[PDB]
Design a protein around this ligand. Structure first.
Ligand code: FMN
Length: 107
Protein backbone atom coordinates (compact mmCIF):
# COMPACT_ATOMS: atom_id res chain seq x y z
CA UNK A 1 0.00 0.00 0.00
CA UNK A 2 1.50 3.31 -1.13
CA UNK A 3 0.69 6.90 -2.04
CA UNK A 4 2.07 9.12 -4.78
CA UNK A 5 2.58 12.87 -5.32
CA UNK A 6 4.14 15.17 -7.90
CA UNK A 7 6.14 18.26 -6.91
CA UNK A 8 6.79 21.14 -9.31
CA UNK A 9 10.53 21.81 -9.48
CA UNK A 10 10.18 24.76 -11.87
CA UNK A 11 8.95 26.58 -8.75
CA UNK A 12 11.67 27.28 -6.18
CA UNK A 13 10.22 25.42 -3.16
CA UNK A 14 8.91 22.27 -4.92
CA UNK A 15 5.17 22.71 -4.27
CA UNK A 16 2.96 19.65 -4.58
CA UNK A 17 0.77 19.79 -7.69
CA UNK A 18 -0.84 16.32 -7.74
CA UNK A 19 -1.59 13.76 -5.04
CA UNK A 20 -3.29 10.37 -5.20
CA UNK A 21 -6.49 9.84 -3.22
CA UNK A 22 -4.54 7.56 -0.87
CA UNK A 23 -2.22 10.40 0.12
CA UNK A 24 -5.18 12.47 1.28
CA UNK A 25 -6.77 9.50 3.03
CA UNK A 26 -3.48 8.54 4.70
CA UNK A 27 -2.49 12.02 5.91
CA UNK A 28 -5.97 13.33 6.72
CA UNK A 29 -5.42 16.50 4.67
CA UNK A 30 -7.52 17.77 1.80
CA UNK A 31 -6.34 19.00 -1.60
CA UNK A 32 -7.25 22.52 -0.41
CA UNK A 33 -4.46 22.14 2.16
CA UNK A 34 -1.94 20.10 0.13
CA UNK A 35 -1.78 21.52 -3.39
CA UNK A 36 0.57 24.47 -3.75
CA UNK A 37 2.52 23.62 -0.60
CA UNK A 38 5.86 22.01 0.10
CA UNK A 39 5.50 18.48 1.47
CA UNK A 40 7.26 19.41 4.73
CA UNK A 41 4.01 20.33 6.52
CA UNK A 42 3.81 16.60 7.36
CA UNK A 43 6.87 16.95 9.64
CA UNK A 44 6.86 17.62 13.35
CA UNK A 45 8.60 17.26 16.68
CA UNK A 46 10.25 13.86 16.21
CA UNK A 47 11.31 14.13 12.57
CA UNK A 48 15.02 13.36 12.24
CA UNK A 49 16.81 16.47 10.90
CA UNK A 50 19.66 14.34 9.57
CA UNK A 51 17.15 12.53 7.34
CA UNK A 52 15.33 15.72 6.31
CA UNK A 53 18.73 17.01 5.21
CA UNK A 54 19.29 13.99 2.95
CA UNK A 55 16.22 15.02 0.94
CA UNK A 56 17.10 18.73 0.97
CA UNK A 57 20.49 17.96 -0.60
CA UNK A 58 19.26 15.34 -3.08
CA UNK A 59 16.64 17.83 -4.28
CA UNK A 60 19.19 20.64 -4.69
CA UNK A 61 21.59 18.27 -6.46
CA UNK A 62 18.74 16.82 -8.55
CA UNK A 63 19.23 13.19 -7.50
CA UNK A 64 17.01 10.34 -6.41
CA UNK A 65 16.73 9.75 -2.68
CA UNK A 66 15.02 7.42 -0.22
CA UNK A 67 14.59 8.23 3.48
CA UNK A 68 12.66 7.12 6.55
CA UNK A 69 10.73 10.01 8.12
CA UNK A 70 8.44 10.44 11.10
CA UNK A 71 5.34 12.23 9.85
CA UNK A 72 2.15 13.47 11.47
CA UNK A 73 -1.43 13.32 10.25
CA UNK A 74 -3.78 16.30 10.36
CA UNK A 75 -5.05 15.04 13.73
CA UNK A 76 -1.51 15.06 15.17
CA UNK A 77 -0.96 11.31 15.37
CA UNK A 78 2.40 10.12 13.98
CA UNK A 79 3.23 7.53 11.36
CA UNK A 80 6.42 6.31 9.72
CA UNK A 81 6.81 7.31 6.08
CA UNK A 82 9.19 5.48 3.76
CA UNK A 83 9.67 8.15 1.11
CA UNK A 84 11.40 7.86 -2.27
CA UNK A 85 11.81 10.98 -4.41
CA UNK A 86 12.70 10.58 -8.10
CA UNK A 87 13.78 13.53 -10.26
CA UNK A 88 12.16 13.92 -13.67
CA UNK A 89 14.33 15.74 -16.20
CA UNK A 90 13.60 17.45 -19.50
CA UNK A 91 15.70 16.47 -22.54
CA UNK A 92 18.06 19.39 -21.80
CA UNK A 93 18.96 17.78 -18.44
CA UNK A 94 17.08 20.23 -16.20
CA UNK A 95 14.80 18.89 -13.46
CA UNK A 96 11.14 19.65 -14.17
CA UNK A 97 9.28 17.73 -11.46
CA UNK A 98 10.01 15.55 -8.46
CA UNK A 99 7.82 12.49 -8.00
CA UNK A 100 7.33 10.85 -4.63
CA UNK A 101 6.27 7.40 -3.43
CA UNK A 102 5.29 7.37 0.26
CA UNK A 103 4.71 4.14 2.21
CA UNK A 104 3.33 4.00 5.74
CA UNK A 105 5.70 1.47 7.29
CA UNK A 106 4.44 1.68 10.86
CA UNK A 107 3.56 -2.00 10.21
C1 FMN B 1 6.97 14.36 1.58
N1 FMN B 1 7.04 13.90 0.31
C2 FMN B 1 7.76 14.58 -0.65
C3 FMN B 1 7.54 14.30 -2.00
C4 FMN B 1 8.28 14.94 -2.98
C5 FMN B 1 8.05 14.63 -4.43
C6 FMN B 1 9.24 15.88 -2.61
C7 FMN B 1 10.04 16.57 -3.67
C8 FMN B 1 9.46 16.16 -1.26
C9 FMN B 1 8.71 15.52 -0.28
N2 FMN B 1 8.87 15.77 1.08
C10 FMN B 1 9.88 16.72 1.66
C11 FMN B 1 9.87 18.22 1.49
O1 FMN B 1 9.28 18.61 0.27
C12 FMN B 1 11.32 18.71 1.60
O2 FMN B 1 12.06 18.23 0.50
C13 FMN B 1 11.99 18.19 2.87
O3 FMN B 1 11.23 18.57 4.00
C14 FMN B 1 13.43 18.67 3.05
O4 FMN B 1 13.64 20.02 2.66
P1 FMN B 1 13.49 21.20 3.73
O5 FMN B 1 12.93 22.44 3.07
O6 FMN B 1 12.56 20.74 4.83
O7 FMN B 1 14.83 21.52 4.33
C15 FMN B 1 8.12 15.04 1.98
N3 FMN B 1 8.30 15.34 3.33
C16 FMN B 1 7.54 14.70 4.28
O8 FMN B 1 7.71 14.92 5.47
N4 FMN B 1 6.61 13.77 3.87
C17 FMN B 1 6.47 13.49 2.52
O9 FMN B 1 5.59 12.70 2.19
Amino acid sequence: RHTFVVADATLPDCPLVYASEGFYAMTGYGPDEVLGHNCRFLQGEGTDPKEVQKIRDAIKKGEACSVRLLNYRKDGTPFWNLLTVTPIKTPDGRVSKFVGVQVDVTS
